[PDB]
Scaffold this active site. Sequence first.
Site, PDB file in Angstrom:
ATOM      1  N   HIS A  65      -7.918   0.715   1.500  1.00 30.51           N
ATOM      2  CA  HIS A  65      -7.014   0.117   2.475  1.00 30.51           C
ATOM      3  C   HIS A  65      -6.589  -1.286   2.058  1.00 30.51           C
ATOM      4  CE1 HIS A  65      -8.935   2.658   5.974  1.00 30.51           C
ATOM      5  NE2 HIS A  65      -8.268   3.397   5.107  1.00 30.51           N
ATOM      6  N   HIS A  92      -2.039   2.251   3.546  1.00 31.97           N
ATOM      7  CA  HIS A  92      -2.907   2.992   2.632  1.00 31.97           C
ATOM      8  C   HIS A  92      -2.180   4.266   2.222  1.00 31.97           C
ATOM      9  CE1 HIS A  92      -4.063   4.647   6.689  1.00 31.97           C
ATOM     10  NE2 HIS A  92      -3.715   5.740   6.033  1.00 31.97           N
ATOM     11  N   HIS A 117       1.128   5.337   4.304  1.00 37.56           N
ATOM     12  CA  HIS A 117       1.027   5.051   5.733  1.00 37.56           C
ATOM     13  C   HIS A 117       0.980   3.545   5.967  1.00 37.56           C
ATOM     14  CE1 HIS A 117      -0.799   9.262   6.768  1.00 37.56           C
ATOM     15  NE2 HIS A 117       0.511   9.291   6.597  1.00 37.56           N
ATOM     16  N   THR A 197      -5.011  10.589  11.353  1.00 42.83           N
ATOM     17  CA  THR A 197      -5.208  11.822  10.595  1.00 42.83           C
ATOM     18  C   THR A 197      -6.632  12.074  10.107  1.00 42.83           C
ATOM     19  OG1 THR A 197      -4.516  10.859   8.464  1.00 42.83           O
ATOM     20  CG2 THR A 197      -2.796  11.787   9.884  1.00 42.83           C
ATOM     21  N   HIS A 198      -7.565  11.219  10.516  1.00 41.75           N
ATOM     22  CA  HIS A 198      -8.972  11.395  10.179  1.00 41.75           C
ATOM     23  C   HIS A 198      -9.793  10.740  11.288  1.00 41.75           C
ATOM     24  CE1 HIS A 198      -9.502   7.207   8.922  1.00 41.75           C
ATOM     25  NE2 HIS A 198      -8.561   7.320   8.002  1.00 41.75           N
TER      26      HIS A 198
HETATM   27  N1  M28 Z   1      -4.270   8.184   8.684  1.00 39.27           N
HETATM   28  S1  M28 Z   1      -3.530   7.344   9.819  1.00 39.27           S
HETATM   29  O1  M28 Z   1      -3.412   8.140  11.031  1.00 39.27           O
HETATM   30  O2  M28 Z   1      -2.327   6.717   9.335  1.00 39.27           O
HETATM   31  C1  M28 Z   1      -4.609   6.030  10.199  1.00 39.27           C
HETATM   32  C2  M28 Z   1      -4.110   4.726  10.544  1.00 39.27           C
HETATM   33  C3  M28 Z   1      -5.017   3.698  10.845  1.00 39.27           C
HETATM   34  C4  M28 Z   1      -6.410   3.945  10.809  1.00 39.27           C
HETATM   35  C5  M28 Z   1      -7.406   2.898  11.122  1.00 39.27           C
HETATM   36  C6  M28 Z   1      -8.480   3.011  10.032  1.00 39.27           C
HETATM   37  C7  M28 Z   1      -9.653   2.077   9.927  1.00 39.27           C
HETATM   38  O3  M28 Z   1      -9.570   0.916  10.379  1.00 39.27           O
HETATM   39  O4  M28 Z   1     -10.706   2.452   9.352  1.00 39.27           O
HETATM   40  C8  M28 Z   1      -6.849   5.247  10.450  1.00 39.27           C
HETATM   41  C9  M28 Z   1      -5.987   6.284  10.146  1.00 39.27           C
HETATM   42 ZN    ZN Z   2      -3.276   7.648   6.783  1.00 38.70          ZN
END
Ligand code: M28
Ligand code: ZN
Length: 258
Positions: A65, A92, A117, A197-198
């Site tokens: 990230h 990321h 993203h 997405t996770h």
């Molecule tokens: N894949 S996604 O939906 O674009 C997304 C965006 C932001 C986080 C926050 C992540 C973190 O702070 O660990 C996690 C996942």
């Molecule tokens: Zn993502």
Amino acid sequence: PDWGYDDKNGPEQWSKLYPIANGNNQSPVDIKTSETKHDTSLKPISVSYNPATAKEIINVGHSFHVNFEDNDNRSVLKGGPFSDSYRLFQFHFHWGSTNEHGSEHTVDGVKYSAELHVAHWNSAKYSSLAEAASKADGLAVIGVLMKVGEANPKLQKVLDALQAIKTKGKRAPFTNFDPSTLLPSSLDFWTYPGSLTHPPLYESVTWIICKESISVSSEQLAQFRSLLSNVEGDNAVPMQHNNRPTQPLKGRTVRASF
Ligand SMILES: NS(=O)(=O)c1ccc(CCC(=O)O)cc1
Ligand SMILES: [Zn+2]
């Protein structure tokens, strides 16, 4: 961590620990252009990022990230389906084991090699990312599909920084960078209510998927996959993939700005 992308802790098994994985607002999804609704109330997307907000790049085991300072509105997203200003906090990527797949969202069933993203949180209604993260209107994420082809020079600073965060937990300063330089020339988009997405998979994301893709070479993708998910000293475990399969729309409507 209790989740990952392997066989036993992967996407197909996430619902055991995170029941929301089988929710009605899960992401990513397949965008069927024949079923999208061209809305006229959708304004153009407007991004204004301050390169000075770039802060740090971190290897988080399953991905990496690039975080930004989010104490004020120096870097924000506006327009589109939003009435509130969203504050940039991170960007990321997601990629697959081979060039054949890797993106999370798909368009008319077509899978791309990777996906970018750029995430933001609603600073107009909430006081922090922590608060906003679980709110239905808390997050806004721009998704850009990456099509394997010519090397993308705009990825250079990011790629060159990876050698300093090869293993899980390593982090390093990553400054003076404007992520708007990674976005495609045209900002036409599709939008729908979705989720992270996770894990924790919160259904708090208003997605903004760009119609136009950006390029990335086979060698650049190899660089993402050369990152290690293990901690320094242990047997190397390459970060082969981290993209989640597309989920059911469950009646949601994908709107098009074009
Ligand atoms: N894949 S996604 O939906 O674009 C997304 C965006 C932001 C986080 C926050 C992540 C973190 O702070 O660990 C996690 C996942
Ligand atoms: Zn993502």
